[PDB]
Amino acid sequence: GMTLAKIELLKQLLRDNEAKTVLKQTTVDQYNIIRKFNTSRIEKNPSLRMKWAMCSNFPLALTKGDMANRIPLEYKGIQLKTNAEDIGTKGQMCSIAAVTWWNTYGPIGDTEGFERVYESFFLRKMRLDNATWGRITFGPVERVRKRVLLNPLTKEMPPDEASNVIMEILFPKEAGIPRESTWIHRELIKEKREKLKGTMITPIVLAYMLERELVARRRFLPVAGATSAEFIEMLHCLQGENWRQIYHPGGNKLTESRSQSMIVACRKIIRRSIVASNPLELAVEIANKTVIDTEPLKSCLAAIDGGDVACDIIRAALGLKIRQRQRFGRLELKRISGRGFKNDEEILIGNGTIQKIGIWDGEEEFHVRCGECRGILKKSKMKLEKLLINSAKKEDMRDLIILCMVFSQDTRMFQGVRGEINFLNRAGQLLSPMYQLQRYFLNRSNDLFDQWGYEESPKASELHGINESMNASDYTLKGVVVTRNVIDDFSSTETEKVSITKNLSLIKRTGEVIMGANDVSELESQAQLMITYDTPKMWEMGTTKELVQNTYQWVLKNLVTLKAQFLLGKEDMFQWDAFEAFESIIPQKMAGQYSGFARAVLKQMRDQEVMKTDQFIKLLPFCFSPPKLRSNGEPYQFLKLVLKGGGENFIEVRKGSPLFSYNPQTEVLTICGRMMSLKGKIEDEERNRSMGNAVLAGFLVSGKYDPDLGDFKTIEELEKLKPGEKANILLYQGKPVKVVKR
Amino acid sequence: AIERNLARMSPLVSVTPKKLTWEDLRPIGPHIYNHELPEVPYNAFLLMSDELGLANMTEGKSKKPKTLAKECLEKYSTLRDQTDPILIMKSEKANENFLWKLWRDCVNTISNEEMSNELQKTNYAKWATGDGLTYQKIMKEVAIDDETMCQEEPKIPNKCRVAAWVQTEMNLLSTLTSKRALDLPEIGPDVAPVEHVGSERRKYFVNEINYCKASTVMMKYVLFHTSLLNESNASMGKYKVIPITNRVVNEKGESFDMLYGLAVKGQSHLRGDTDVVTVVTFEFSSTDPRVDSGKWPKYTVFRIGSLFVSGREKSVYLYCRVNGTNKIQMKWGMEARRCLLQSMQQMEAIVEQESSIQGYDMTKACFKGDRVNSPKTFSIGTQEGKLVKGSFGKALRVIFTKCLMHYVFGNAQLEGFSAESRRLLLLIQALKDRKGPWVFDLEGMYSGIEECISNNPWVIQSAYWFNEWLGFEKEGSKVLESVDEI
Amino acid sequence: GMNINPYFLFIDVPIQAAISTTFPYTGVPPYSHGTGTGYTIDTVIRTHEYSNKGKQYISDVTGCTMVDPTNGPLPEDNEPSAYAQLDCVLEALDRMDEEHPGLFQAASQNAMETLMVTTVDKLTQGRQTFDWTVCRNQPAATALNTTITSFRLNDLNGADKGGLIPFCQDIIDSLDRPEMTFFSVKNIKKKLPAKNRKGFLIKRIPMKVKDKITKVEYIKRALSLNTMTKDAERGKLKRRAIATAGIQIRGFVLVVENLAKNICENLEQSGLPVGGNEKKAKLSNAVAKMLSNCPPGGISMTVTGDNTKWNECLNPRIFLAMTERITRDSPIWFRDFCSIAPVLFSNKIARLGKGFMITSKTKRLKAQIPCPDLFSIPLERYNEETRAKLKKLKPFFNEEGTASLSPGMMMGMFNMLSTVLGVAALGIKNIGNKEYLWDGLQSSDDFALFVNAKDEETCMEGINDFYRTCKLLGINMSKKKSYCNETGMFEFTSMFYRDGFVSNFAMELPSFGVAGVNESADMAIGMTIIKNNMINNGMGPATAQTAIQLFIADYRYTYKCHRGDSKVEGKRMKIIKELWENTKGRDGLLVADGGPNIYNLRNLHIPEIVLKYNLMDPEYKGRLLHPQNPFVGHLSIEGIKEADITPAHGPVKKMDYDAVSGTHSWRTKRNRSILNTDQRNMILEEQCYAKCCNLFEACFNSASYRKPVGQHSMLEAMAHRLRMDARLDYESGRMSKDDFEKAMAHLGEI
RNA sequence: ACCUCUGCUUCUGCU
RNA sequence: AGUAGUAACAAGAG
RNA sequence: AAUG
Ligand SMILES: [Mg+2]
């Protein structure tokens, strides 16, 4: 037995009177102090100590015992270990050749149960080995710094709950007070006690590996494309800043990640195809050659029962029975009738802050489900009206009631926010506010149930009014009906009414619309699984910076034909099939006015022979959309051209921008940080050609800056001048020019 | 309360911001131009472009460095048996007799049949290493009662002018050779296409570094610092002969063993990290020290024989120098291969920025060219006051040589100089981008730069090259003032 | 006659895209030689020079000469002034509270709730600490343990109750103790007769007695900061001094820095405590926000700024007002707790150092003059610069060899509260209703200022008002290092923004070597470093594979383990070649045993034993993965998990690797320099502790993973655990009826 | 004591 | 000597 | 959408 040995050792330690006073005086907390007492020192330069110490005679220390005695004192002249004991371990000091003597002629130990301890590492190697690689492509990549999970887990738990799990698995007699985590995690504990059955690995290594495979490591990494953990563990070899590698790991991909990647794919396909001509054709064409990491898009659309709005449009375009099943966190809803509309509004929330939350016009009806509880819901804008929930478990009824309160955006839940809720990241990026409210009221809804507003219950023989404990009472919350009948929640899946038009609108068999292409979200997020387009011009399903850089590279490459058939051909150059992917990232309220302005600038350059080739490259891709003018038969005047996403995605008309810069000294164009040498494509005298001729629409250069016209004029002032008028304009910092309109 | 505290403060508390122009950019370091100051000597550890290795063909094996030097000297036995010193140049506080006795001791000890390269502690060895030169530690009362024991004035570095040999080292180390001194080990086989792209790009980026002279010098430094650290920790109270060797491979695969000299180690009981071990280095060369005698006042040069490389008669000189090092410089000499990475990445990133413009891989199309793309060329030199362009590989070799001279001539003067001139580089860049930069106190910037230019050769030649480059940037900016021409 | 110019690359490439060639980080970092007393005395002189126009007095606690620059007179020139006005600081903090309502109360409540559940063993986590009992620098868990074992001899027992608040209560109650007793070590000499010359054999043995100091001596030792030189600091020509505080200010600086961290996390302009890609995302969002807000036609500009004399020109008397302003709506006990660290920092006493060395060059003698005896020598026996410093130190020199340093925050320890003060300077945005608006970014002494105005002259007027405003809070902005250009490129904390943050591979170049933990950890650390630099710092595939080759070459030359089929010599290769001739699975050997390198880009994230487990010999994998190998030893969980790497710019960062505990997870021997000094008893004093702990983890096996909690003794818990083990042994047949009697008789003795 | 220890181990006081 | 650079090492201790 |  190993108990009487410890009692004999405790009787031994009481004779050392210093150890007796240390045992009697030091408390169990202060043990954490006296464990770290030594004569050592944290080395400020450890690489120098390793390089200096490896050249010495005996640089290592041995654990005192029977296993260090098996190493001999010398081996063929080489002195392995010495007799001088160590200060800390009180064992002998050996050379680094003693390690190789142990690996070559030492005793052979029982490594039974080894592949079950380090199973996270062998599963990592298995995901590498059973993987396949694809093409490598060169081109721009916009990486977004996102907080992602580094390694995949067996089960994601909070660190104190995972510590309770590890203490139940490894050291069960010291787990202390039992939590409720033992009953949830009983099969994981039984499995992990089966797997670590008869191993001789020390329990500190087992605890380190169990904490490695249960506790999450979430860090900020630059991510473009896939953010699931099986891709974040290969993010170093997945893509860089200027290349991408198609990769599919081993194992088996999930269903939530598959559905979220399907939603991201359908949103990108719709967001590209809306600005096209004949949008249904390009929607089906791109959707037929999309691969969600192993499998086509149609297989995910026919195998997964989710997908919000864009998935239904791509489903009905490919030909598929649509599934109108929304998922608000854990709230699985399916509509009956009613068509809301999203619009941003500055809600003044209960704790005293302003948030741009989206609210919905209309009146809607839902079949809702949470866990093993079901119900029917009916609402309007910021107004929970009716909720007939079936009877199920009490806390499942609680979760469903809280989720239906949060979903309806009812003002008794908006003003019922009294606590600490952070609607922003630590790095200052937008969190979704409704999911923040949902995660807040899933724990602390006592303010919600206090100030929600009570009423009386209907006292029919089938209905039961609810108190806060979900039992039978009458001081009930406003609008909750508990009938004992059945509801047949998700069995009434019958709508054979696809019938899409050109503009991607699911028109019913009656004749009305239920879905629209001006109904999908605008919040572009990164997919969990890698998503490929097996097509020429995959880059048209790219971000704003990638589309800008690819479009400007394509204009630069084909510059001679564009410029020659612009000087010779009149109105072919604008309506070009390579610029639809550039109008995919211009807002639809501004694109026609941008097109009229840029077309007037280029027409002004070609009519009177002043040509800046940087202005031609800059304002050529904005010309594709059909132009929209003002009411005076005049185009608009802009200082910058603002594109989708971010605040640094603008094209300055006069000076440089982040996305577009031009240097006339070195003749170097800079698109998104990449330098294209324009040396050899510009004309002869283009450094003495006037710059203010290609700045506004109908505004040439009449001469040098003169103070008899007053100060500089802004764009609203120049938009309201008479034709045949002089003005003063600052092009960039240092060049004021006197300018005649028309 | 801030408006009332700012209404009563003096108007003399201001930034006084001045708008920066090109005319405000005077040349840094005028005192390196005046000829009263002596030109800066050679103070590196080993010879770099004046080196000469005694080759000896081997069969792709390893052996003891004593037997390597013994065989390399057995081939050149004329230089080994020369026992008559022909003194050419002598350092001021040196001893030509003791350094020649130490050279004969190194030759007679590296070429016997015993396996031990220890050196006896004779009077010339004790002079060249320095024995009993440390001061005695006495108690503080015995010295407080004294009046002669004053605190010494610490030495400040000298002020030197531009020496013409640093440009010669920069020109010679960037040129290709026919030998490959790198010892790069293997990696795993390739599966992913990124690994194939990396291997194909490495077969371009590594050969250009590998054939140049600076990689041979780098490997000489690395191997000498490794063996010197091992012998400093191993045998502490012993003077040991450490041969300066390198292993080299020609264009046809035949290996050779270059022996560049011998080196004596002092008595290294190095406790602190800044404690010095004395190293007396004897190195072969073929450079006449009286062509450029302002470069070597630290070296004692003998003439020990002649060699026939193909058909011509090159003399062989021996450069003897007392020198020293510590554990920190030896550790950074072992980790001196990283001058590859800082030179490779900076060029490889450029190649990657080409590929995103073109869609395919552009390593061959930047090093050599193809049917569509022209080769890549960089402004890298100056001939008769005009520009000189070069290839991508020459720019890679130039950045590798710069990152090697950062190690070899690197002390606190180079740290302060780089950190204080980076702001001036960014100001010149802000003038080139037409951002219109403003300065608050420009003379403080120059005064903080110029206090680090004392006697480091790389710092003085970097100030010279900065003045030359700034003069080239000023005269090219005149097309920016000619825009809109009104 | 072509001459190569390496600056000419900047003709074709921009400088920000080539900035890695402007960092000489392959050279040696500058180390300080000798003493650091000159830099300490220079810090004291420069601190009292920038505040000499304030209120001078002599303290009626210690006796030292204190200077008060706060609410002193306004400056009249561009010298660095420490005369911070109190109303300006309070107006800045009130505007910061008005911009973020509820922030101060939330930060104070989170800091108070975090203080209420903090233990004393939080004070074992900061590398070196000034020990007042031996007056030296010690590890924190030995300084803390000596403080506790000396507090026990004075009826001060806030360490037994386990919380941090009773321990800090006993800390501030020891300042009222008239005498302090502690354990020190004297030496007793001993005669040994032999056959010898010049007498006998001298054996002076150091032994431990109780040394007692007075009240004011203890108060001066508690307020002391020990001073050293900053070694291996890149980017500077001349060296500087750093400080290290005692254990009796750590518990309060912990809470005040926690409170300032809770404020800094919720401010849009503090570039702290974020780091890595989180800092890059936050600053990119801030710049992209401030760039899409310039007026149409107006001019935005960016000041790349540095702060000169940041540590000498701040004040603990301003930080005291900040901890009184932030904790307005807190209970009074927390307001008394959060107002002790600026009190102990406003009365601090700088210990100078090792003194100066006087040498005789003719006689070749030298001696070390300590800091008490600095003025017990004529000043004509110093050099010019040291005599000039010793003339100016004299009105502040305490006679026991220390100096009074009342103004200035020496070396920091308030890096987030000074960030809060800089952010409060940044949030004012306008003075006098003029037509500009500023904002910016602020790390500890580093700012970047964005100004949107009409034209450039109004921008410079706003920058001038920002300079004059920062003079009122004690922020002296540097003019020899700050410059200002248009918005679109700047620099901040060695990050170079040029239309997006560019990569700077050179600053991470010194971390690419062998880290130096052991053979097992260094390979994992090296491959993790190459992987992280491929993700973060823009290293391509060819440079990553070159880094793998260079790392394996440096690894083999460091640890003396070349390939077995290579013909290198050495004491280790004689057995590596024997391993190469016995092994049939030669591709399953590790690199540390002469195996081949197997890593490439696709498998950098997998450990080496896991990559080669299905290629090993069963005898080799049995001997390498032995459960009871004598090389691993007693394991703690952070030693298995993490290792601390210091960057070239910033404090040390621990990184966590993945490795299998084999025979290559050895540990280096203990540095035996202590066997000749006077601290040999601390060897025995360690091995009296360790035995006790090595029995405790015998009885309580979860003590390595879980921190043991409890106010009872360490003997009571062990005796109860042994009694329950013996009872459940006899109630299962796993003991005898006689050995149970022996066990219970021994426990009846105990 | 041509003996022993040490190579990052800190020097307020025993001096 | 020399390394080096505002102060040290060129062995320290018993 | 998250998980501090
Ligand atoms: Mg800065």
The helix/strand/coil state of A361 is: strand
> Which tokens in the block code for residue A162?
């995972």
Is the Cβ of A636 closer than 8 Å to some Cβ of chain C? no
**Whole-angstrom Cα Rg for chain C:** 31
> Which tokens in the block code for residue C251?
């518990």
Q: Give the single-character DSSP code of C126.
A: S
> How far apart, in whole angstroms, are the C-alpha atoms of residue A229 and residue A236?
13
**What positions of strand F are covered by protein, i.e. any atom < 7 Å from a CB?**
1-4
CB contact under 8 A, A136 and B193: yes
- What is the chain B residue with the closest CA to A553? B357
> How far apart, in whole angstroms, are the C-alpha atoms of residue A580 and residue A534?
19
The helix/strand/coil state of A94 is: strand
Selection from A221, A278, A231 nearest residue A502 by Cα: A278
- Three-state SS annotation for A547-595: HHHHHHHHHHHCHHHHHHHHHCCCCCCCCCCCCHHHHCCCCCCCHHHHH
> Which tokens in the block code for residue B422?
């980076």
Query: Which residues of B are less than 8 Å from C477 in CB distance?
Result: 15
Q: Which residue is nearest to nucleotide D4 (CA to C1')?
A: C676
> How far apart, in whole angstroms, are the C-alpha atoms of residue C43 and residue B444?
21
Q: Which of chain B's residues 65-94 bind strand E, using a 7 Å CB cutoff? A: 91-94
CB contact under 8 A, B415 and C6: no
> How far apart, in whole angstroms, are the C-alpha atoms of residue A259 and residue A308?
10
Cβ-in-10-Å burial (0-12, 13-18, 19+) of A318 comes to middle
Q: Pick the residue of B10, B19, B426 with the most C CBs within 10 A to test the interface with C by mutation.
A: B426
Q: Which residues contact A631 (CB under 8 A, 6 or more apart)?
A: none
Strands (DSSP E) found in A167-274: 218-223, 243-248
Q: Angle at CA B220, nearest 5°, toward B219 and B224?
A: 115
> How far apart, in whole angstroms, are the C-alpha atoms of residue B308 and residue B319?
20
Distance, CA of C714 to C1' of E13, in Å? 40
C125 — phi, psi (to 5°)?
-120, 25
Domain boundaries, chain C: 31-266+308-413, 267-307+414-501, 502-668, 669-750
Nucleotide showing the shortest C1' distance to residue C386 CA: E6
What distance lies between CA B102 and its chain's CA centroid? 27
CB contact under 8 A, A735 and B484: yes
> How far apart, in whole angstroms, are the C-alpha atoms of residue A699 and residue A724?
10
Query: Which residues of C are less than 8 Å from B462 in CB distance?
Result: 7
- Three-state SS annotation for C450-513: EEEECCHHHHHHHHHHHHHHHHHCCCCECCCCCEEEECCEEEECCEEEECCECCCCHHHCHHHC
Strand E at less than 7 A from CB of C190: no
Q: What is the DSSP string of C203-217?
A: --EEEEEEEEEEHHH
The helix/strand/coil state of A132 is: strand
CB contact under 8 A, C666 and A110: no
* Residue A579: strand pairing partners: none
**What positions of strand E are covered by protein, i.e. any atom < 7 Å from a CB?**
1-14
CB contact under 8 A, A30 and C620: no
Is the Cβ of A219 closer than 8 Å to some Cβ of chain C? yes
Query: Which residues of B are less than 8 Å from C235 in CB distance?
Result: 415-416, 418-419
> Which tokens in the block code for residue A223?
């991510």
A531: how many CB neighbours lie within 10 A of its CB? Answer: 20
Contacts for A117-120: CB closer than 8 Å, 24+ residues apart = A117/A196, A117/A199, A117/A201, A117/A205, A117/A206, A117/A209, A118/A209, A118/C610, A118/C660, A119/A195, A119/A213, A120/A151, A120/A154, A120/A209, A120/A212, A120/A213
* Residue C67: strand pairing partners: C56
Q: Pick the residue of C473, C546, C548, C672 with the most B CBs within 10 A to test the interface with B by mutation.
A: C546
B54/chain C closest Cα distance in angstroms: 22
Residues composing chain C: 750
Asked whether A158 and A180 are in contact (CB, 8 A), the reply is no
Q: Angle at CA B138, nearest 5°, toward C242 and B235?
A: 75
- What is the chain A residue with the closest CA to C263? A426
The helix/strand/coil state of C398 is: coil
* Residue C186: strand pairing partners: C207
Asked whether A87 and C670 are in contact (CB, 8 A), the reply is yes
Strand E at less than 7 A from CB of C357: yes
The helix/strand/coil state of C227 is: strand
> How far apart, in whole angstroms, are the C-alpha atoms of residue B52 and residue B59?
22
Q: Which residue is nearest to nucleotide D12 (CA to C1')?
A: C135
B328/chain A closest Cα distance in angstroms: 7
Asked whether A547 and A586 are in contact (CB, 8 A), the reply is no
- What is the chain B residue with the closest CA to A52? B233
- Strand C55-58, strand A703-704: pairing: unpaired
Is the Cβ of B359 closer than 8 Å to some Cβ of chain A? yes
* Residue B240: strand pairing partners: B118, B265
B313: how many CB neighbours lie within 10 A of its CB? Answer: 8
C442: how many CB neighbours lie within 10 A of its CB? Answer: 28
* Residue A377: strand pairing partners: A366, A387
Q: Give the single-character DSSP code of C674.
A: G
Match 């005369």 to its residue by tokens.
C83
The interface residues of chain C toward chain A in range 205-244, judged by CB-CB distance below 8 A, are 231-232
The interface residues of chain C toward chain A in range 444-473, judged by CB-CB distance below 8 A, are 456
Q: Which of chain C's residues 26-45 bind strand E, using a 7 Å CB cutoff? A: 30-35, 37-39
> How far apart, in whole angstroms, are the C-alpha atoms of residue B199 and residue C541?
8
Cβ-in-10-Å burial (0-12, 13-18, 19+) of B34 comes to exposed
Resolution (A): 3.1
Q: Pick the residue of C505, C543, C612 with the most B CBs within 10 A to test the interface with B by mutation.
A: C543
Is the Cβ of B226 closer than 8 Å to some Cβ of chain A? no
Task: State which residues form the domain around A129.
Answer: 1-250
Selection from C590, C649, C619, C252 nearest residue C446 by Cα: C649
- Three-state SS annotation for A630-686: CCCCCCCCCCEEECCCCCCCEEECCCCCCCEEEECCCCEEEECCEEEECCCCCCCCC
Distances (CA, A) of C697 to A31, A307, C25: 11, 54, 46
Position C481, amino acid: K
Query: Which residues of A are less than 8 Å from B483 in CB distance?
Result: 664, 687, 691, 735
Sign of CA dihedral A348, A352, A357, A363: negative
**Strand arrangement of the beta sheet that strand C483-486 belongs to:** B18-19, B438-439, C483-486, C299-306, C446-453, C436-443
Is the Cβ of C568 closer than 8 Å to some Cβ of chain A? no
B118: how many CB neighbours lie within 10 A of its CB? Answer: 12
Cβ-in-10-Å burial (0-12, 13-18, 19+) of C399 comes to exposed
Strand E at less than 7 A from CB of B155: yes
- Strand C224-229, strand C349-351: pairing: parallel
Nucleotide showing the shortest C1' distance to residue A328 CA: F1
The helix/strand/coil state of C134 is: coil
B161/chain A closest Cα distance in angstroms: 34
> How far apart, in whole angstroms, are the C-alpha atoms of residue C232 and residue C146?
31
Q: Give the single-character DSSP code of B189.
A: P
**Whole-angstrom Cα Rg for chain B:** 27
B-C contacts (CB, under 8 Å): 413
Cβ-in-10-Å burial (0-12, 13-18, 19+) of B35 comes to exposed
Nucleotide showing the shortest C1' distance to residue A329 CA: F1
Cis omega before residue C273 (within 30°)?
A: yes
CB contact under 8 A, B477 and A665: yes
C481/chain B closest Cα distance in angstroms: 7
- Strand B438-439, strand B386-391: pairing: unpaired
> How far apart, in whole angstroms, are the C-alpha atoms of residue C53 and residue C34?
35
Taking phi over 0 as left and psi of -120 to 50 as alpha, with beta for the rest, B403 belongs to alpha
> Which tokens in the block code for residue A550?
């690819």
Query: What determination technique applies here?
Result: cryo-EM
Selection from A443, A465, A439 nearest residue A454 by Cα: A465
C-alpha torsion angle, residues A656, A658, A660, A662 (rounded to 10): 50
* Residue A336: strand pairing partners: none
Q: What is the DSSP string of C735-749?
A: S-TTHHHHHHHHHHH
Roughly how many angstroms between the first and final C-alpha of chain B, as a whole number? Answer: 49
Query: Which residues of A are less than 8 Å from C698 in CB distance?
Result: 6, 9
The helix/strand/coil state of A707 is: coil
Selection from C158, C658, C303, C10 nearest residue B428 by Cα: C10
A-B contacts (CB, under 8 Å): 92
Query: Which residues of A are less than 8 Å from C623 in CB distance?
Result: 102-104, 106-109
B17: how many CB neighbours lie within 10 A of its CB? Answer: 23
Is the Cβ of A715 closer than 8 Å to some Cβ of chain C? yes
